Amino acid sequence: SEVAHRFKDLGEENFKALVLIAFAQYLQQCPFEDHVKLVNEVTEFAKTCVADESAENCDKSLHTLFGDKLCTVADCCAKQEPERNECFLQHKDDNPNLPRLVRPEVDVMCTAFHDNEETFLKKYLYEIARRHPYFYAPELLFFAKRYKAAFTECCQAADKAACLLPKLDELRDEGKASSAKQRLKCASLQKFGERAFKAWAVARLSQRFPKAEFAEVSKLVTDLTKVHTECCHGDLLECADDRADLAKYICENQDSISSKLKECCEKPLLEKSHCIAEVENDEMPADLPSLAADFVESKDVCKNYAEAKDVFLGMFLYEYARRHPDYSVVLLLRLAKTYETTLEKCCAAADPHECYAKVFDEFKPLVEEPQNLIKQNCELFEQLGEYKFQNALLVRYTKKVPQVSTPTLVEVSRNLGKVGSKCCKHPEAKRMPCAEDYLSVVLNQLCVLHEKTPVSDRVTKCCTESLVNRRPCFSALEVDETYVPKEFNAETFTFHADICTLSEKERQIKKQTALVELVKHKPKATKEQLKAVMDDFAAFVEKCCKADDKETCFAEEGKKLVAAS
Ligand SMILES: C=CC1=C(C)/C(=C\c2[nH]c(/C=C3N=C(/C=C4\NC(=O)C(C)=C4C=C)C(C)=C\3CCC(=O)O)c(CCC(=O)O)c2C)NC1=O
């Protein structure tokens, strides 16, 4: 019995939490009570399967059981058992149409938390899982614990708010980043294949554990790949289980992997896993030989490449990565790709060595492009500040791909602008991996949000031609020349002065949702005049809100401000 096996392994509490998450991210629209009901039913069926390991249908796979259960509250269900599952996965909505969740006053939360604790927690997982269908399940358990600790500690102190609100924000943020990072790992596996994912891990783990040996790193990558293959496919229970087995292993071999795995291995399961996943890069091994020796000077290259190209190319990436934590993971993959393309062409020639001898020479432009890009943007950022930098980015992206919907552009550009504060404060040595790998996560968001309802062949081409070159592809785009300006209309922007009650930030989002709309009418409008038409609008909500009158200006000053623009 598979259901029984996972129950004993994970326990009862984690078991219940994981099924809730799996169900919440399969049917994101259904109510809490429905999932809660289905979860308990399943758990009871799991208990009766523990005793009699051959009861009702304790033989059925996790898929079938979970599948039949959801089909009691829902096309997809009219399918059979392999693919009826694939049907569900295909309908996960990355941008669900769900109500903006808002936190009541601290007093209503502490009561709810104190009265029924298990319920207050199940609701956390449900609200988070249904809005982030690819959220890394095992980590959602880790955050749940931290959430519980925020309430347990703060709901007793003096200023509860001054103790809870800050920690719940640090959580919400760390959570969005975690969700984005995981959405990319799932996109790699699902759109590009496990080989693209393994190349990514080999490179990332080699930077983190330079003292590990290719054979050890290769084992780690293999396991990590299964964990993610499973989590990204909805096999939440075996993902959590297998993720525990990997944490166990890594600690039982700290010495053959990394020294900085200390603190990690001296703590709770959930936290140990989290710690290992974010541990800092180890110190680079003593004296490592030159890469040129075994990869460009040697005469066996083409022979080794023929013998086992995959193993050989993995070795190249591992070697180049372990000694370059100053390079972003995608640049490493890019270099590895250039090496591959060269051996493929050179090894088919007469004198191979002479052909692939100056391969490192082709690496030069590849390394310098990202470095110049990070410098140019941190400079702009530093002098303009976040808000202004995001605006500079909004005009740029809207001109690049005018078809994309205003909400996606505004959302994607605001995140792109956060690279400024997230990375520019580091020393040039750690800026690239920080910047480019972060830009990869955000651009992935644009690719998945756009993939649903495509409207731009330019976004589609950059998103699907190559995972590693996504950032450079978008960077090479300029202004869409074939775009035909939008026709202005009334409802273009509901100037309803209900914005005066909105937070200073949602006011910027609305003030940015307008800048996008304008640039769509005046693609050719210079950044100059645009950098002025904003002030003209800031004046609007300014006077209109402070003015003690009806929504007049929202109608009068609004339809009159249009003539002034
Ligand atoms: C009285 C009880 C009660 C509350 C408090 C409630 C609303 C409510 N609003 C929330 C905000 C939210 N919290 C998140 C996200 C996260 N938050 C995280 O801890 C993590 C790890 C993520 C990442 C996925 C989001 C997206 C929202 C709503 C929109 C936003 O502000 O970002 C949350 C999630 C937990 C939190 O961030 O504090 C709840 C439960 N409804 C209720 O009945």
From Swiss-Prot:
In alphabetical order, the GO MF annotations are: antioxidant activity; copper ion binding; DNA binding; enterobactin binding; exogenous protein binding; fatty acid binding; identical protein binding; protein-folding chaperone binding
Result for mutant: residue 59 to N: In Malmo-95/Dalakarlia
GO CC annotation: what is one? extracellular space
Tell me what effect the entry lists for residue 368 to K: In Hiroshima-2
Reported effect, residue 546 to E: In Church bay
Give all residue intervals belonging to the Albumin domain. 1-172, 173-365, 366-563
Which biological process annotations from GO are given for this protein? Answer: cellular response to calcium ion starvation; cellular response to starvation; negative regulation of mitochondrial depolarization
Please give the annotated consequence of changing residue 556 to K.
Answer: In Osaka-2/Phnom Phen/albumin B/Verona
Family, per entry: Belongs to the ALB/AFP/VDB family.
Protein name per the record: Albumin
What is the species listed in this Swiss-Prot or TrEMBL entry? Homo sapiens (Human)
